[PDB]
Amino acid sequence: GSHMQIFVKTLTGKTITLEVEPSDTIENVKAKIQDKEGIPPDQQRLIFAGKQLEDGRTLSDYNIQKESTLHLVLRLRGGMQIFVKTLTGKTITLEVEPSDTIENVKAKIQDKEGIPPDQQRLIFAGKQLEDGRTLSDYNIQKESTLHLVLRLRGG
Amino acid sequence: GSQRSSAETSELREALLKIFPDSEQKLKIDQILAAHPYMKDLNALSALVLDGNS
C-alpha cells in the first residue's frame, strides 16, 4: 500500500494523525480534517516547514513524507477588538467585525472621540486604508493596532 | 486590552518560530510583534505572517 501517516499540529496543542496518500491534494487533507475534527475547510490554513500549502497541490508536490508534521492555522471570524493609536499618545479601543467597512470604523472613532471621519486617515501595516473597503480586505486581525492620522481641516 | 509583557511576547515569538522557521520569517515575526503590542492570539499573529502584513 502507498498510504502513509502524517501529523497536523493545531495551535491548541492537539495533534491530528491522518492517513493519506502522496497523491492526495491539500484539498483532500482539509476534508479529512473536517471529517475528523469538524473544522470547515474554508477556515483551514495548512503549513509545512513554514510554507502555506495551496489547495490544488499534492502532498507529493510539497515533498511531504511519511510521519511529516504540518501545522494548522485557523482563520478567525466574528467580533473582535482593534486598537487605534493617535499622534497625541491615545489608544482608542474599538469593537469591530471583519465585515465592517473602513467607513464604519471611522464612524466608531467619531462616536468615541468626536473626530470627523473626513479628517481621519487610518494606517495598517504601512498602508492607508480606503473608505469603501472592509477590515477583512486588508487582513486586519483581532487585537491589531491601527494608526490614526489627523488631516489638516479648516473647520 | 493590556499590552503584552516581555514574557508574553517571548512565548508568542517562540511559538511562531516553530511554525515559521526561515531566516526571513524570524525578522518579520519580530517586526509584527513590535507593531501590534496587544495581539495575544497565535492564529491572528500567524495570519499577519502568512499574508505579508508586516
UniProtKB/Swiss-Prot annotation, chain A:
Disulfide bonds: none annotated. Changing R75K: No effect on ADP-ribosylation. The modification Phosphoserine is found at S68. The modification (Microbial infection) ADP-ribosylthreonine is found at T69. Changing R77G: No effect on ADP-ribosylation. There is a cross-link at G79 (Glycyl lysine isopeptide (Gly-Lys) (interchain with K-? in acceptor proteins)). Changing G78 to R/Q: No effect on ubiquitination by CRL2(KLHDC3) E3 ligase complex. Impairs ubiquitination by CRL2(KLHDC10) E3 ligase complex. Changing S68E: Phosphomimetic mutant that binds and activates PRKN. There is a cross-link at K9, K14, K30, K32, K36, K51, K66 (Glycyl lysine isopeptide (Lys-Gly) (interchain with G-Cter in ubiquitin)). The record marks H71 as: Essential for function. Changing R45E: Impairs ubiquitination by CRL2(KLHDC3) E3 ligase complex. Impairs ubiquitination by CRL2(KLHDC3) E3 ligase complex. Residues 4-79, 80-155 form the Ubiquitin-like domain. Changing G79D: Impairs ubiquitination by CRL2(KLHDC3) and CRL2(KLHDC10) E3 ligase complex. The record marks R57, R75 as: Interacts with activating enzyme. Belongs to the ubiquitin family. Ubiquitin is encoded by 4 different genes. UBA52 and RPS27A genes code for a single copy of ubiquitin fused to the ribosomal proteins eL40 and eS31, respectively. UBB and UBC genes code for a polyubiquitin precursor with exact head to tail repeats, the number of repeats differ between species and strains. For the sake of clarity sequence features are annotated only for the first chain, and are not repeated for each of the following chains. This is Polyubiquitin-C. The gene is UBC. The chain holds residues 1 to 152 of 685 of the full protein.
Curated annotation (Swiss-Prot), chain B:
It is found in: Cytoplasm, Cytosol; Nucleus; Nucleus, Nucleolus; Nucleus, PML body. Proteolytically cleaved by CASP8 downstream of TLR3 or TLR4, leading to its inactivation. Cleaved by caspase-like protein MALT1 in T-cells following TCR-mediated activation, leading to its inactivation and subsequent viral reactivation during HIV-1 infection. Mono- and polyubiquitinated on the CoCUN region. Monoubiquitinated by NEDD4. Polyubiquitinated, leading to its degradation by the proteasome. Sumoylated with SUMO1, abrogating polyubiquitination and subsequent degradation. Desumoylated by SENP1, leading to accumulation in PML nuclear bodies. It comes from the Eukaryota. Induction: Up-regulated in response to interferon alpha (IFN-alpha) stimulation (at protein level). Detected in heart, lung, brain, liver, skeletal muscle, pancreas, kidney, spleen, testis and ovary. Residues 4-51 are annotated as: CoCUN. Belongs to the N4BP1 family. Potent suppressor of cytokine production that acts as a regulator of innate immune signaling and inflammation. Acts as a key negative regulator of select cytokine and chemokine responses elicited by TRIF-independent Toll-like receptors (TLRs), thereby limiting inflammatory cytokine responses to minor insults. In response to more threatening pathogens, cleaved by CASP8 downstream of TLR3 or TLR4, leading to its inactivation, thereby allowing production of inflammatory cytokines. Interacts with NEDD4. Interacts with ITCH (via WW domain 2). The CoCUN region mediates binding to ubiquitin. Does not interact with NEDD8. This is NEDD4-binding protein 1. The gene is N4BP1. The chain holds residues 848 to 896 of 896 of the full protein.
